[PDB]
Design a binder for this molecule. Structure first.
Ligand code: UVI
Ligand code: UVI
Ligand code: UVI
Ligand code: UVI
Lengths: 261, 261, 261, 261
């Protein structure tokens, strides 16, 4: 059907993209970057993140594919030299689709705004001290003082979450995971410390204690939100779909990225 | 129906048990510690652990209830003074049952043996160096050198898992979590470090590299296994059932145990 | 001799300060906030930090004293009700002086600027990715990618350093300690991870890899430095002096602040 | 003067040792494994540890040297191919000596026994629960419940201490560092968590709460001590001496062992 290709913009990526476009022309494959059904990303995990967000409004009508021109990525897990074999199988079809959970973030003001994260959503302070009350399903759980908090999808657990001490979880688990950034713990101030892993339908809510200005990030983009009253996290009802041509198990991707390849 | 009561054996616990037995006599409640349908545990989490294991062969035909005569427990989350109101509702019935996942451990020799964990199963060395190959769904993931490994149920994540840096996960998630004990990491030796959270049907397998003698624990009991060829972990097909009379959310139990009460 | 008193500015602190000033008047004690020999700080650790920095140019000619009107502080470790007994002993004198090491930070441009930290000096990115080469005594040790780095005095180790996983060290040790904030570690990127504790005369130097704009903090104040070529850390030749009237061991202050009081 | 050589016992090590012995014969170098002044260790850090302990009673009268026939060691930091150049300089002399602090452990009964550690001394339980009161300079600091405690020399901080989260400290710092193994922390039980770094002359003392049987290790050897009343740690008055022929800075050894080589 219809397809498009994003590129990191370096010479490798642009040239591989132009080459793939020519291969597609040799099939009944029409390039449409408006309503594609296949989105190919050429570059790294960042390039793939950008492609996801470019088309987050047609997630149900798209299967994504990642080609890494640099080191192996977690989302771009196909090698540039397999590119021709890829165009081939994309044309004849018959591939299976694989779905990863996403994270929904809602920001309320005194008005609302929602975002969808593939990696994670984080909250920090606009400079001043970061103090937030953490409420779980309307139960006040803790008062967090520190640098910030990170809420991660399953596939995001090998990203920022990992650097904060979070657990890696298999993407077939419909869950989200909360980790702390440098929490203060003394006689006066008390956080759980451990990461927290939440199931579908649980709502984690952050509420300001003094300052109501926070730097909120969603994947690679950071927005300053003024006069904030609440930040709601929950596992999204929407999912991202991957075109899969081949067995490449998550734990193998983990081993290849972190242990040895 | 039929019921039984275990006690920690201190005076508080024995006396509360004898008192509850008298209250049950005032209903059509017959004490049977052979095929009970209700198992009451009076004491702490250890006492409850012992009660689970005493009756692990009739898990489908039993609902458990925990009374803590000391500090609040995670499994024994009812207070001693609510004991009379408890006997009451146990008799009239109409309570709901709540189910937590369990962990299945298989130990192979050169013969087999399986165990069921409510908290966690751990592996350490019989003194010598602990070196094990970790295989995930038949894929060699890492060679672990260190003090040992811990595999935890969801409800076990607030126990040993927590002290090892693991994430706390809500018990409605059918999963198991692997954490490291003091792994060596240098130029030569490489582990993931992060905890790992596995879904149902995944099989984590530990295989010896030199020494084949390990100290294996399952909840509060530690068995020395000689001439071991494999230790298989997976989320069990069996589940533990709790009689629930009242809303006491897991995250509240967490907040009460660790943040403040 | 000459003395001055800073206050947090709340009613407790101002009133205690005015009361102490009256007690001093009853001795040969002259209030001079220009060249004091005794600096009293009334409030919390922040108030004390501000007092240290107000007079960092006469550190050799001053003995500091902290009064906490809130919870116990690490620098303000005297209780408000002992205030009269304090004025007493300050007048008759004969107290001993205690000295804690400080941290020297030098920032070079393309010009120079040095700062003195009592708690710690940190470095983060002006938004973009934080990538810095870490050089120890001119030997390239690691390329750090992550949120930032923290360099701590001994007395600072119970502050930000503690929240980052650093070790607590007794203030009689002339050293500084470097900790990581969320470092990325994968096949491509490699940091030591462990905190590092440096002796006197060692020079840790941070050098930019791409972006040369960093947010640099020294205790409670954060400065944006543009066109930065180097940040040099070393244990300072200058030390802070405390008037001591009483044995209050560091490890007891630690136990009281973090374990129980 | 007099010298001796230990070997790991594999063919590489034995053959290199016999070769070095022949080179020494070509000088006024007499082999004496009773009162040597130079102790050469051929193998790995374990082999070197064994050599230190073989001669711990003549530490003031010996300079140690490590040759690694496997990967680089922290104590055996000379390569096998530099062996001839080594025998050379050992004969003509004029080398400088470098000294690392050691750890003194005293075990009291109801009688006494002291040990000297180059890496670290650890304490665990004989199976039952490990509960110990930690007293610092006679001040009760904390009640530790968990798997055990580790007390490390500076040069030991890259060994077991490192795997437990401890800080790496430069060996010129006369100090010792205490780290926790899986401590329980909840409403009831409270430890500091952070590693602790102690200066010379401080005494950390462990005292039993119930069980008085512990597995105590000193470097590579583990002794079961029954009816124990106290374990005292302090920085030793004795130091280990290294023959140094060449600049090989500690932080470079760290970088080479852990970052890349
Ligand atoms: C300041 C800065 O770094 N700007 C962001 C530029 C990169 N991007 C793109 C990416 C990605 C990605 N996605 C994945 C993935 N899903 N799984 C595994 N690796 C992945 N990666 C790998 O992350 C490594 C570091 O760029 C690269 O090698 C990628 O292969 C934003 C993502 O950065 C993550 N992050 C931000 N502060 C972090 C920190 N302090 N520590 C660790 N992670 C951090 C965050 O997650 C965000 O979503
Ligand atoms: C040597 C020794 O301790 N012998 C075991 C005696 C206790 N038992 C009974 C229990 C329990 C329990 N079950 C739960 C639960 N599910 N959730 C939360 N708390 C719970 N608890 C609480 O654990 C605290 C410590 O006893 C108590 O206060 C309980 O309220 C064995 C259980 O000990 C756990 N463990 C063993 N080494 C540990 C360590 N180093 N660190 C932390 N945990 C450790 C392990 O899990 C085992 O399954
Ligand atoms: C954003 C923000 O917090 N603004 C700073 C306002 C406070 N100030 C004053 C203080 C202090 C202090 N000095 C000591 C001391 N020497 N020892 C022990 N406690 C101490 N305290 C205690 O720190 C607790 C938290 O304010 C209070 O309870 C004090 O009793 C700046 C100091 O904040 C430290 N910090 C900054 N991000 C931190 C983090 N994420 N985590 C932990 N620490 C962090 C940093 O060290 C700086 O130097
Ligand atoms: C059960 C077992 O392992 N038996 C001990 C056999 C090894 N020996 C010899 C050694 C050594 C050594 N000394 C140094 C040194 N000073 N600096 C850096 N590396 C060093 N190494 C390196 O340690 C790596 C692991 O053998 C090797 O690669 C060596 O190059 C005992 C030493 O093991 C240490 N340990 C014990 N449980 C540990 C754990 N769980 N995690 C990390 N460390 C652990 C402990 O320190 C003891 O003192």
């Amino acid at each position: 059907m219809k397809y498009m290709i994003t590129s990191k913009g370096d010479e490798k990526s642009d040239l591989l993209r132009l080459n793939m476009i020519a291969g597609f022309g040799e099939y009944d494959m029409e390039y449409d970057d408006v309503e594609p059904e296949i989105v190919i990303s050429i570059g790294g995990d960042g390039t793939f993140l950008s492609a996801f967000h470019q088309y987050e409004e047609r997630l149900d009508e798209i299967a994504f594919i990642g080609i890494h021109t640099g080191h192996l990525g977690f989302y771009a897990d196909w090698r540039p030299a397999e590119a021709d074999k890829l165009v081939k199988l994309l044309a004849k079809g018959e591939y299976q689709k694989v779905s990863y959970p996403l994270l929904k973030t809602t920001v309320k003001y005194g008005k609302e705004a929602t975002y969808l994260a593939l990696n994670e959503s984080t909250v920090k302070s606009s400079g001043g001290p970061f103090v937030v009350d953490v409420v779980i399903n309307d139960i006040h759980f803790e008062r967090f003082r520190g640098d910030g908090l990170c809420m991660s999808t399953p596939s995001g657990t090998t990203a920022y979450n990992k650097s904060l001490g979070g657990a890696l979880m298999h993407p077939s688990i419909e869950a989200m995971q909360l980790t702390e950034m440098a929490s203060i713990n003394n006689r006066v101030y008390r956080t759980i410390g451990s990461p927290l892993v939440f199931p579908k339908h649980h709502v984690v809510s952050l509420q300001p204690v003094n300052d109501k200005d926070f730097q909120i990030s969603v994947d690679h983009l950071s927005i300053l939100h003024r006069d904030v009253q609440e930040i709601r996290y929950e596992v999204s009802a929407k999912k991202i779909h991957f075109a899969r041509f081949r067995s490449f198990p998550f734990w193998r991707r983990v081993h290849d990225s972190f242990i040895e390849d």
